[PDB]
Point group: D2
């Protein structure tokens, strides 16, 4: 069934699927890089290329190096890509050249061929829009791919990751306020400790997410800087005067995000330290999220022979062999995502060290890892919020049982009956399996009413 | 346009797309874990589940707890899955429950419903093969997902990763032999050193891959052990006597690989140390491959601004105004894959620490990272071999130019004038921009005839 | 020779070296944690404990829970520790409890016993200053160790790491300015590329360090927050009202650094996300420094059969067997330090995920890794600056040779003689081993004088 | 107060502290690499250099290139170093040249000068044993430092790490046997599951350590290969015929460990893949040890707010007002050590990728991280064994309380009433806060006598 057209270059003929909008160079690149599943370059990178190619055409026309009719042809195809209509025209993998050259050429060819069809021609004829001379005007593969990487990274963080974390933080803050008067037993070293409120414990999670949000936002100004206009080595050779600033202005306009031209194009090509910087903040959030998810599943564990202090939503059967068992599966998905982010940080950091001279040629692996972390954190925070956090409720009788049976409240008695008598009560309760109150009364040291007045858990959760 | 049928599990009713062969539990997971791209659980895991479900049915029939007609129904659908016909029936993500329960239930439901249709029934009616009582007989998610992970991991390593590395090693060995008489300049600390042959340098790469292959093969016996038969917590509750050994024998038969039952089912459920062990060896290979690929692009650097001791193939047309351009495409793809494997090792090691009590619930992320490393190493080694290594050739004039002018050829004068005198010659040439021979004569330390007789790079590539 | 005194607790007698100022609890802790070399807890942590113990005594006296005479006794020993006089009194390892409990008790015992000697008593007699009741008043091991960790971390970064990076950045900036007119050949993919100046290449390194400095400084406000006053679980039980704010004020005064009380004490005890945040910025600097050091040793490689574009200081013989060889050993030390920092980041991130409930009990390993990275980056930047960067000089003849022999300048001819003639010149030069100028002249396409006018490398390093 | 003598190398004159036995090159390094704490190069590396310098002298004398009287002078100082008498003569840091050249020169200079004093001369005079011509005869830094790294690494693993892990494994095995009849509740996903014995749970830990020991031992043959004899670039230039084999034999004799000469000297200089390989196995052990230590503190959590199924020893006095306090001191030390090993693996893997051409110049950082992991695992396993594992005891009343309460004991009714009816019972008790038996009677699904006869935890810890 597969029908081909025949294209030609200095390697000879090359068959291209007859209906596909890529060209000879993209087709050869499929075979040169058969590494992992086809088409693995992230769609967000292709979308970002559409933004920057449109902006380059607009800047080039303003600066009188590209005719406006060709700008319009290019821009129309870019809009189609941005609308999600052409993803099946991008068959190339992440694991291509480290400059992402083949993906740059893939969008140049697709824009060229689709423009020809939009102009009324037949796919496979020579286009009015030349892939290199027109679509790639004033550009290099070297400066286009890192621009796409930053556009995609910034957009994912600001439009997906941050909103998702913010929503989860808001839920945990509302829960913290709802739980502010529920006194529970602390655990340090996993061992019995002095009291705090369930709201205080949840307030820690809120504060962790607030700090992670601040830290991630701190990284945005460096990520906003774009390499476009540095061309092959950073000097801007082959760009019209002012192109750097103008093309960044168009990118900022079309994306609605505050992109600027990079202050130092050599730094922008030879390294991807902004990706290292921003990914470190994603990893900081993953570190906090792991701990939050871990605590919540421990607090919900049981329902009889674990901790059992909270209830969480029960969304699906947990087991076919153990009937009625339900597991904290949203917490599990979150902790697995966090494990992924920590390893993505290893990869990004390694790749970030490995630039040589004028160019870091690890760009696709850095982009792929960054976008994966940003996306998975966003998606897991949405899922965990909607399917776990919004439904957390206290098990007030279990919490109260733990408080009443604890030996750790005994020090409330020291100022009233002295250290030695307090210790005698705790030692007797421990030996007998009884409560502090039972032994305070039955040793004749404190009346029931005086004990209730002196040992108030709600008075033990502040200075 | 979406039409649903109504199904149920022990928790309630669930609307399931009318034409899909999964059931209530798969549909819940599909909707409850919208995390990353759709349907991301690796197809290798689904295929491995098909092998183990077929084996479990065969073992259950032999041990007289499942009728053979139901075995045949189950086995038929497993065959369809293995033939690649039913991947649209597996919509679940990696980022699900950490035991992989939901993918276990996905295959149980698909086998049950497709068997009913194969039997002449209507999709949605009660099946002759119950998903839990028949397809999951003698099993838990807790022992099935680890079993699928090991089957998939072992098969990827033995059928893909090892053959690809072996082929690349063979090419580098043939190149080493072809280059055994070409004397080049060593570089240590990036600085000019003493001679070695290009074949000797390439023989190092060969040895590195041979050691990595041995180290990876050393990890196979632990990876061959299967959890299947441990059921919920490791005790084998609800298995027929002898099921653990028999089901492993059927898995070994159907896969053609030497799987055995795990000696300790608690170790097999509560941790995935075999994945840590085997991935460490994949990472060892990636460390060596990075260095090999890095050296080859450095040796090829050019045409004029660098080293230029070797030529590498061109895989793209190039341009007429850029003659002699060098495009180290495969070196870049390989080094990026290696960077990926390093971080996959961090993830696997982290997840491997995190088992609690009777179960590690990081199983899908461990399986996904392992399979990715094994696949990308295999594919990158094939591509690097075919599009780079087989075509490496020496630039003999450039090699000779760079060896003949190394100042550290003065090491050859150590035996005649002492290491201190030789240092003064090399230090003087470096300061004056002159040659070794001219300064040795200027210093009155060596004559011209003595210099030509004593300084021969071809005599410096072996022992005394 | 070893003479002991005999102390006593409920485990029985314990021999303590007769002249040492620690007590029974520290002595037992030596044996309980024989893990790695003795005394490995960083001296900076001990110094930080001295600051916080002095501040706690001052706050406690102001708030009328500790007599001023005992404050003075405690403060005097703290001053001795800060003067570096008592490090031999701290024998405990990093690998103790994860709350650092044993090091807290070690300073409490040393302060107690040294105060007694300062008061005119004999070491081994009962002290006027009780280790727990006085030196540990209003405190827990749980809130003291993380306070010491932040004090030590912040001080190391601001007093050592940042100044060292700043100095190196300044040197590289001066070199960039000095080299601004030296045109050299770019390298992308390790392969010949279009020109840039040596000053432009060095300006990339400067920009990388400037961004890393900004990123590290962004992490300081979270690191300035101190846990002290949270006590065992975060509630501040057993502190006088206002102690949290007052003790942070004293710490800020005594250290001269802008410490504040943590806004959320649960976040401050249950996690060490500020250490993750700040270490990610140290790792970002290490990623940049690796690339900078790698480029510099590649550019200096040879001196005959490598790159050879720069000279670096030659500080020592590189080899005994190869006479006169000198190696870029400062670059090697730097790259090894950077490798260390990347693994320290793995450890800190792992430990940061592992808090449970009210307390993260991975505090010493996080503190040790953080201080090691901050110290090694500082020391390597000083050494690399003084013994390499200040002495970098261009090899102008070698740089010029590479420019004159490059095929990459041929595109300067396109607008003057056309693509086809330019390509003919490049193809002929490549085939013959000659220069572009030689073939332009000898093909009769360009005169020598016209070639020099049209192909000016200094005009090819901007837009 | 500081008095110096004047020395020189091929680069110029150097002032050396008058009473120190090092020379000009050590003094340059001491002053040029003020990075981290003073004198940080591991003493195990210095000791390993003493073994290899003694072996080189013995091999050189046998092969007729060094007189036996000079061999004896060198060997005597090597013995003094091995006895621990000269560590004050080694002031250099890890963070020096990446080949470790400066530490090689440090031992050459110290041997030379101490031999002269041993011969009756004055420190600072010309020695009978030349540091380069005699002590470094047939050697380079490029082959000596990797040799020292392997000697030190292998000795630490076999003489410290393996014995410590083996002892801990034996203790856990004895505990598993002692606990084989104590039925406890399994936990999966942290949730109450079906029973297993406490001995079964501990047997998982034993199996994990056994696999880690096997994996570590599998890495020993690569680690046994020594670079010595490759000299500057791997060719063996300037070695006598047969020196590589003979010097390895002397190293094996003097250390008592089964070292051999490396099969490929280029692989042995340009990469440290054996360190990557062996460290991955140390990291595998650390991954298992983390999980074991984590479980033990979770099982001990208490006295009243947690699980409390086991007792662990107390190692500190405690306080009268805090009876029953549990202090999981060794679990914290162990888990922190394990966190350290994970990051050491990142560093070693990164450095292992970074060799260029004939030499990897990340040798000291690789050696330092490897030795730290091997040492800390050994010490932590000794401490954890002696101060925690040997004293673990069951809390049998608490264990029984927690198993009798598990709703997943309802799994035992599956064979009688079906998985769906059993689910309703457990779901009802969970909703109502009642017991399984009470709801099963209320639902009319099981009688009281049938429940007592059918539900027995002790019958659920094996197969059908």
């Amino acid at each position: 069934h597969m029908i081909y057209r025949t294209e030609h270059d200095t390697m000879g003929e090359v068959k291209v699927p007859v209906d596909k909008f890529w060209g000879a160079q993209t087709e050869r690149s499929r075979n040169n890089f058969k590494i992992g599943p086809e088409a693995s370059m992230p769609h967000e990178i292709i979308e970002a290329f559409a933004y920057l190619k449109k902006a380059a055409a607009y800047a080039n026309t303003d600066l009188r190096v590209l005719p406006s009719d060709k700008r319009d042809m290019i821009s129309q195809v870019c809009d189609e890509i941005l609308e999600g209509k052409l993803f099946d025209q991008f068959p190339l993998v992440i694991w291509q050249t480290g400059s992402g050259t083949q993906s740059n050429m893939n969008i140049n060819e697709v824009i060229s061929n689709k423009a020809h069809v939009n102009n009324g021609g037949q796919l496979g004829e020579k286009s009015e829009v030349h892939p290199n001379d027109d679509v790639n005007k004033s550009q290099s593969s070297n400066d286009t791919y890192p621009t796409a990487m930053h556009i995609a990274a910034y957009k994912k963080v600001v439009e997906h990751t941050i909103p998702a974390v913010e929503t989860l933080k808001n839920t945990l803050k509302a829960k913290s306020e709802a739980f502010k008067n529920i006194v529970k037993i602390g655990r340090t070293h996993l061992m019995d400790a002095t009291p705090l409120t369930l709201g205080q414990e949840f307030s820690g999670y809120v504060a962790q997410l607030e700090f992670g949000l601040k830290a991630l936002k701190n990284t945005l100004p460096h990520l906003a800087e774009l390499a476009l206009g540095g061309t092959a080595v950073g000097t801007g050779l082959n760009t019209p005067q002012g192109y750097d600033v103008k093309v960044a202005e168009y990118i900022a306009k079309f994306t609605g995000l505050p992109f600027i031209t990079a202050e130092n194009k050599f730094e922008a090509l030879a390294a991807h330290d902004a990706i290292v910087e921003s990914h470190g903040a994603l990893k900081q959030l993953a570190v906090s999220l792991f701990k939050i998810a871990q605590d919540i599943r421990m607090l919900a564990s049981g329902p009889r022979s674990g901790i059992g202090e909270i209830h969480i939503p029960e969304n699906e059967p947990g087991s076919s062999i153990m009937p009625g068992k339900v597991n904290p599966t949203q917490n599990e998905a979150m902790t697995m995502v966090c494990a992924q982010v920590l390893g993505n940080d290893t990869t990004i950091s390694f790749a970030g060290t490995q630039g040589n001279y004028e160019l870091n040629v690890f760009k696709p692996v850095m982009a792929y890892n960054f976008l994966q972390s940003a996306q998975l954190i966003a998606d897991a925070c949405i899922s965990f919020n909607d399917h776990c956090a919004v439904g957390i409720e206290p098990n007030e009788p279990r919490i109260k049982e733990l408080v009443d049976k604890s030996l750790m409240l005994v020090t409330a008695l020291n100022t009233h009956i002295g250290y030695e008598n307090a210790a005698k009560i705790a030692k007797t309760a421990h030996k007998n399996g009884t409560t502090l109150k039972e032994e305070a009364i039955n040793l004749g040291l404190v009346t029931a009413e005086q004990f209730d007045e002196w040992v108030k858990p709600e008075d033990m959760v502040g200075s």
